[PDB]
Structure 1
Amino acid sequence: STHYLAFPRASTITWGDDTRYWSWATVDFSSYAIEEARLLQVSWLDCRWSMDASDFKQDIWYNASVEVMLTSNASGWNVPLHLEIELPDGSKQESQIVLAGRQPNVWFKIPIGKFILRGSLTSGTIRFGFYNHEGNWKRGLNIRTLAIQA
């Protein structure tokens, strides 16, 4: 059951206000207007949401996913895309996915980790993110939302 949705405008996307690299497009999401972030091309791919641990209930396992689509112009995905959750104490969940195998123009959710908040970690920043910083061109990824479920 989904507790929060965090749209890309709330994230920090490196080069996200440079129209050479990223565009933004308004779409309806249920009753709301959201803007999808549409990657044209970068070598430095980096998207990071930050939300406080106090936003969440303690002693409860949450899992987080990002909803994305590969465009008709998709290339450069044969590399590992890093998936990260960083907790208030600096500890991290870290995993990777290869998107090159995926079909375009279809929404799909990538799981980026699970966490539970106990003791010290029940307050302070939590980062949710994904990145690839290799010197190859990543093209044609549209980002819909971060979802946090429990």
Structure 2
Amino acid sequence: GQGQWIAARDLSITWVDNPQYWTWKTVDPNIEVAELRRVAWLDIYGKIETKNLIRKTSYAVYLVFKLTDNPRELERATASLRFVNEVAEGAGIEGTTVFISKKKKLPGELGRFPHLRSDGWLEIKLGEFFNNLGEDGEVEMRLMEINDKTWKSGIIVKGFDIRPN
């Protein structure tokens, strides 16, 4: 209907079923979240059908998460959002740089930073799209940091929030 919610268990998260790299946990009120213990290939992916959404509406897609006390190597990451059918053959993941663990210290600092939601969780905008009549297919999005030389740690993934602007 008016947007969509993707629980963490319905996102495609690389290595998420390996307790060495991710730790599944339940937090109040009885919601399952995936905490990142340590991983070098970070990829959190989700996909929706636009046919389900209210038409003639602009939608924003946010990754809802929290940070532990000691996050690592998550100052920046790559956010991507694109219509599946609009991806040209051979093109890679063509995303944008966003900030995750870095704090916006200057009022004039440029970039997309996370926002503290009313419910105490953080959210980072992955992208934006207009749903015309729900006939343009699937929309996919992800946040990733795949630097093989760094160990990412300290992000608690709750899910993707697709909301009307």
| Range class of TM-score, shorter chain | 0.7 to 0.9
Shift of 1:93: 7.7
Report what 2:95 is aligned to.
Answer: 94
Shift of 1:123: 4.4
Structure 2: how far apart are the matches of 1:27 and 1:126? 29
Structure 2: how far apart are the matches of 1:52 and 1:100? 30
Superposition map of 1:51-62 within 5 A: 51-62=48-59
Per-residue displacement from partner, 1:97-135 (whole Å, max 9, x unpaired)? 1334249xx73111111101236x624322121101112
Structure 1: how far apart are the matches of 2:54 and 2:94? 19
TM-score norm. by structure 2 comes to 0.76
Q: Which amino acid aligns with 1:18?
A: N
Report what 2:121 is aligned to.
Answer: 107
Structure 2: how far apart are the matches of 1:118 and 1:139? 38
Structure 2: how far apart are the matches of 1:84 and 1:108? 18
The question of 1:129 aligning with 2:142 is answered yes
Moved >4 Å (runs of 4+): none
Larger strand percent: 1
TM-score norm. by structure 1 comes to 0.82
Structure 2: how far apart are the matches of 1:67 and 1:101? 16
Shift of 1:62: 0.6
Structure 2: how far apart are the matches of 1:107 and 1:28? 12
5+ long unaligned stretches in structure 2: 88-92, 105-119
Per-residue displacement from partner, 1:43-69 (whole Å, max 9, x unpaired)? 100011111121213321011111111
With 33-42 and 84-93 compared, the bigger mean Cα shift is at 84-93
**Alpha carbon RMSD of aligned pairs, Å?**
2.3
Q: Secondary structure at the match of 1:134?
A: coil
| Aligned counterpart in structure 2 of residue 71 of structure 1, from 68, 71, 75 | 68
Q: Which amino acid aligns with 1:132?
A: E
Between Structure 1 and Structure 2, how many residues are aligned? 142
Does structure 2 conserve the Cα–Cα contact (< 8 Å) formed by 1:93 and 1:114? Answer: no
Q: Which amino acid aligns with 1:5?
A: W
Structure 1: how far apart are the matches of 2:37 and 2:63? 18
Q: Secondary structure at the match of 1:89?
A: helix
Does structure 2 conserve the Cα–Cα contact (< 8 Å) formed by 1:88 and 1:123? Answer: no
Q: Percent identity?
A: 23
